[PDB]
Amino acid sequence: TYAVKEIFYTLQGEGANAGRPAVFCRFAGCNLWSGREEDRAQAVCRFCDTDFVGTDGENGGKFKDADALVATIAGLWPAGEAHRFVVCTGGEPMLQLDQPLVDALHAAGFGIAIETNGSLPVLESIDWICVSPKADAPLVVTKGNELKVVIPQDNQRLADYAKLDFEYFLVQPMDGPSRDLNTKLAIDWCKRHPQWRLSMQTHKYLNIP
Amino acid sequence: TYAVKEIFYTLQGEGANAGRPAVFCRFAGCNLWSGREEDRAQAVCRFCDTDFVGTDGENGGKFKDADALVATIAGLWPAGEAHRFVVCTGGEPMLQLDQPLVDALHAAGFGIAIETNGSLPVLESIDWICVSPKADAPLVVTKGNELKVVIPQDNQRLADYAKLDFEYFLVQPMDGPSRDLNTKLAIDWCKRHPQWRLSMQTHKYLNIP
Ligand SMILES: C[S@@+](CC[C@H](N)C(=O)[O-])C[C@H]1O[C@@H](n2cnc3c(N)ncnc32)[C@H](O)[C@@H]1O
Ligand SMILES: C[S@@+](CC[C@H](N)C(=O)[O-])C[C@H]1O[C@@H](n2cnc3c(N)ncnc32)[C@H](O)[C@@H]1O
Ligand SMILES: Nc1nc2c(c(=O)[nH]1)N[C@@H](C(=O)O)CN2
Ligand SMILES: Nc1nc2c(c(=O)[nH]1)N[C@@H](C(=O)O)CN2
Ligand code: SF4
Ligand code: SF4
Ligand SMILES: [Mg+2]
Ligand SMILES: [Mg+2]
Ligand code: NA
Numbered sequence: 001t002y003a004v005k006e007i008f009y010t011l012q013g014e015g016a017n018a019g020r021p022a023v024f025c026r027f028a029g030c031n032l033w034s035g036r037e038e039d040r041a042q043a044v045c046r047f048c049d050t051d052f053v054g055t056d057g058e059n060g061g062k063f064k065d066a067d068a069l070v071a072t073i074a075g076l077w078p079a080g081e082a083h084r085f086v087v088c089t090g091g092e093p094m095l096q097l098d099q100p101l102v103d104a105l106h107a108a109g110f111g112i113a114i115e116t117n118g119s120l121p122v123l124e125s126i127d128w129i130c131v132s133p134k135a136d137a138p139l140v141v142t143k144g145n146e147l148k149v150v151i152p153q154d155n156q157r158l159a160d161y162a163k164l165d166f167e168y169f170l171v172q173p174m175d176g177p178s179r180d181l182n183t184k185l186a187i188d189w190c191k192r193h194p195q196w197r198l199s200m201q202t203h204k205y206l207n208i209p
Numbered sequence: 210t211y212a213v214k215e216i217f218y219t220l221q222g223e224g225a226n227a228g229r230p231a232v233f234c235r236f237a238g239c240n241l242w243s244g245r246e247e248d249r250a251q252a253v254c255r256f257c258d259t260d261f262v263g264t265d266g267e268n269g270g271k272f273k274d275a276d277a278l279v280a281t282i283a284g285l286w287p288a289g290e291a292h293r294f295v296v297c298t299g300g301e302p303m304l305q306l307d308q309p310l311v312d313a314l315h316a317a318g319f320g321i322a323i324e325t326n327g328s329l330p331v332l333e334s335i336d337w338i339c340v341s342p343k344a345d346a347p348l349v350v351t352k353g354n355e356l357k358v359v360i361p362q363d364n365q366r367l368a369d370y371a372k373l374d375f376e377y378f379l380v381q382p383m384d385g386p387s388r389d390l391n392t393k394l395a396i397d398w399c400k401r402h403p404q405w406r407l408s409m410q411t412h413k414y415l416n417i418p
Binding site: 009010011016018019020021074077078081082084085169182183187190191192193194195196197198200202205206208 | 217218219220225227228229230286287290291292293294369379396399400401402403404405407408409411413414417
């Protein structure tokens with residue numbers, strides 16, 4: 001059983017795969033925030049820009065098994081076209097993503113990406129692992145493909161993140177009332193510490209889902 | 210001897226390396242347009258968004274040899290930082306970029322990217338080869354890292370490009386009076402033919418050089 005907020009076909013807006021066509025599968029629920037506004041100020045992760053509460057979005061629902069979810073995912077892909085790619089997100093996808101879903105996605109020809117806060121162990125048969133550490137939460141995933149850090153956060157040891165085992169190290173400006181401010185901070189950080197690259201939320205500039 | 214319009218340190222705005230700190234070395238001159246506005250309407254490449262005429266830009270000039278050019282490029286990199294990366298552009302860089310320049314940049318710790326219109330042979334020792342084919346020019350570079358196609362151009366055979374030997378296939382919307390239209394075109398193209406990915410000119414959205 002999977003509880004999914006929404007499933008939609010678009011371009012990956014963020015990270016090293018930005019611009020790439022992908023089905024997004026947004027799981028409902030997170031382990032660092034209830035998703036309720038009354039709880040935000042007290043949450044472990046307090047800056048979230050996403051609605052992940054419930055199963056009422058586009059193609060959202062409770063899926064009885066893996067095959068059912070994969071059928072909905074595959075159905076959104078253009079007919080006759082390869083390069084199938086799904087981004088498992090949320091919410092915190094590692095609350096629900098399991099080996100049977102991964103195996104069924106692969107069997108259907110999908111490459112698999114995950115967006116995870118890094119507080120839960122990941123399945124290493126996932127093809128692309130993106131970890132986005134929250135400064136007040138534990139980080140138990142210390143290796144993957146890209147480490148995408150949202151900045152600024154209090155209590156952050158930003159330069160130390162570079163000692164972890166990732167292919168790409170990215171900073172992403174925190175969206176909110178200070179986005180242009182944070183974008184200037186993030187550009188300056190990379191230029192001073194060029195191991196790091198800038199990840200924009202391009203879908204917000206493109207105004208696409 | 211090298212004629213350089215400008216040299217500057219910023220983030221790569223385009224392609225698969227978008228977001229990455231880089232020294233841009235913009236060579237003066239192109240083989241597909243004189244760079245004069247009165248010639249634009251009759252040129253082979255007519256949509257250019259760049260000023261590549263003369264050597265009067267920031268750090269621009271005539272460099273007596275490779276060592277002199279490399280010294281200026283190296284001097285823009287943050288002191289004590291590695292991951293040195295230079296993007297050779299213009300203009301058409303393959304009018305001037307030769308083996309001794311490539312060797313000197315490599316000796317100075319630089320990885321080398323090129324932005325080329327593909328109408329001229331490129332040096333295989335270049336680390337990152339980006340080809341941007343112009344519809345009314347010969348295309349002799351048929352292998353590389355990324356093929357970044359500006360759309361729409363008349364006479365374009367877009368699907369044919371995907372048969373070439375590149376790792377990444379990107380469409381980049383043509384800036385000009387129809388940039389928003391063209392962006393929607395490019396997004397739709399990728400979603401219909403997901404071998405292709407979108408390349409935004411992010412430096413124009415971030416308002417950075
Ligand atoms: C909503 S999270 C879902 C996946 C998982 N919960 C995580 O945090 O990675 C998707 C991505 O957007 C980032 N994000 C969330 N809120 C953001 C904000 N206000 N500004 C910028 N990025 C944000 C997250 O850090 C993460 O990289
Ligand atoms: C100015 S060219 C210099 C390198 C080489 N002459 C070339 O054409 O690739 C730099 C890059 O910007 C792209 N470009 C130029 N004018 C553009 C425009 N109006 N809109 C979008 N991309 C453009 C080119 O296609 C190329 O990929
Ligand atoms: N197009 C698009 N790409 C995204 C997001 C989103 O909401 N839209 N947000 C992030 C997510 O929710 O995983 C990552 N990339
Ligand atoms: N930041 C930045 N990145 C760029 C460009 C540019 O002008 N600025 N234009 C392109 C170029 O001139 O080669 C490639 N990417
Ligand atoms: S961990 Fe991810 S899904 Fe949960 S609140 Fe933070 S950004 Fe949102
Ligand atoms: S080939 Fe490149 S540099 Fe020359 S006019 Fe066209 S876009 Fe500009
Ligand atoms: Mg989101
Ligand atoms: Mg330019
Ligand atoms: Na901080």
